[PDB]
């Protein structure tokens, strides 16, 4: 720092009045713009064939499974499954795949009904870690705001050492300006508008999934009806080997299908 | 025996229904890039 | 003799530093010494008129180079001869704002710390603090 | 009377990578903070 | 009857009031003075900030207003300006480098940046040919963040200049700034890529020379004057009045700016 500097470095505060609300509004507009560009275009509107709330569908699934639980026999993972277990998995998978998109993260049921392949396990771990990190960050930033400390991050620096280290003041003063401006701004986004935009984006897919779930339930009900009817009363080379798949084989087939879809998606971009 | 073949056909339909299902993980723009854009907009 | 010749060549731009670092006032003061200007001016008198004028002009430009680019852009808009007074007034205004923001004793401590970091003489720091206090009221 | 000094030699400014406190706000913004540190080091090396 | 358009971009109210007083006192009311945010002709822009609708940011060293320290110097500093969007929206100079990192498509932005750089390079080569220099100096900030905008800037500016037949020498920001402030006679034409540091360098050079008026070339085609301090704004207004076809008034304003920088309005 050799050489008498001409000016003393006071904090760069010149915008004495910069309301946090305006900064958060700008950070929300920028985020919305970037999200819109990344996603692309709003998907075309989809009209549900049958209007049934997700709550009613969940109630119907629970009622059907509770009624049919009589035939629920536990078996090893590497064992052929029963019609009842197959129906339970096929329905709960759709239900929880919908709930995960809708935003109700329940990492107990999601980890049991939606995770079948190791890639799914990794994705679930990342999702859970990210959600917990976001929650902790939000709580810590609210507590920091209550205390009054600067909203933005502050590096662990000792500028009296940096001044001595560098020979010329210009880079050091520039660094101080940058970090003071960073610590004098709130890198906070209004999650209500962001969530609203995301919801508007994922509306066609959710409605399609709900219609598919309703159709699946209506198609499974007749099978249980036939099974109960038979219970109350009591070329072929293709139909001899047919058997319900073991859970492990289901995992492997799901892995194959997911890898195929990933390969197709990767090939689409080029 | 037609009952047996019909039963195998129904089980085949259920098996096909199960196999076609696959969990679909979506990818969303990482917020670090949004923070970087916000920082740049500040002229930092 | 070698030192003056090297300084003259460096200011004239014929010879640059080892790493092609910018020829600023700070680097020259670091290498040649605190009073390089005086010795260079004394040495230039033993040279023809053109070299004397070039030396004077280069010394003036290097002295202008003592501010960061941002400070020159903000304060040197209305000429270099008026740069020093404008920069001093801006710094005094910043000091007044800091005083009105966070008291006086903290301001005294902060000015002392910056003077320690900014390589300022105690007399200059005392004059600056007295001037800002007087400007406040 | 031998060599005295190479006046045209300047000790390069030894940069230091800024270190951020280890909190959740740092893990969430790890990439952005690393980018800021890299930019700071580049500025220190080149000059501005 | 006539109109001068005043654009305000980050200028303190004192400077704008001084400009308005100067124009009112010198013109005498024959030409009106309206305020706006964008223009293509007969426009003076006040303040460091870059207005909306300008693609090139040329600045020279006028002979009349040469400071005694910088007597005889002749170097043209042209800053390339990309199109400016609203303050809230993400600017092109940052989008072109952040979207690539985020993976978003960057085709339209690349096209717009290419058009802007082609126009700026054409202006720079025209200036170089007029002055007679053989080589131009490109200025790019060497930070890792700006690893895409500067790459495109080089790829296009060097392409256009070589197509015109001149040579280009690329350099960073600190070295060129120091050379321009200390030894500016060794640079004939220096182009600057669009970054905040380059804007600050352009302002520093325009001020250190003694206070000058920067010319902006807009998309519509034309030249609008620019100033940031009292003397610079006075010189910009003088040039604008000259363009409108007023010689004696322009000379009076220029003389007043030369004599009394900070209080030209009272001086004249």
Residue numbers in the entry:
A (entry chain d): 17 to 250, 290 to 325
B (entry chain c): 71 to 114
C (entry chain h): 21 to 157
D (entry chain M): 208 to 255
E (entry chain g): 2 to 269
Give verbatim excerpts from the published study on this entry.
Using masked refinements, maps were obtained for the membrane region, the rotor, and the peripheral stalk. The trypanosomal peripheral stalk displays a markedly different architecture compared to its yeast and mammalian counterparts. By contrast, T. brucei lacks the canonical bH2 and instead, helices 5-7 of divergent subunit-d and the C-terminal helix of extended subunit-8 bind to a C-terminal extension of OSCP at the apical part of the peripheral stalk. The interaction between OSCP and subunit-d and -8 is stabilized by soluble ATPTB3 and ATPTB4. The peripheral stalk is rooted to the membrane subcomplex by a transmembrane helix of subunit-8, wrapped on the matrix side by helices 8-11 of subunit-d. Apart from the canonical contacts at the top of F1, the peripheral stalk is attached to the F1 via an euglenozoa-specific C-terminal extension of OSCP, which contains a disordered linker and a terminal helix hairpin extending between the F1-bound p18 and subunits -d and -8 of the peripheral stalk. Lack of bH2 in T. brucei also affects composition of the peripheral stalk in which the divergent subunit-d and subunit-8 binds directly to a C-terminal extension of OSCP, indicating a remodeled peripheral stalk architecture.
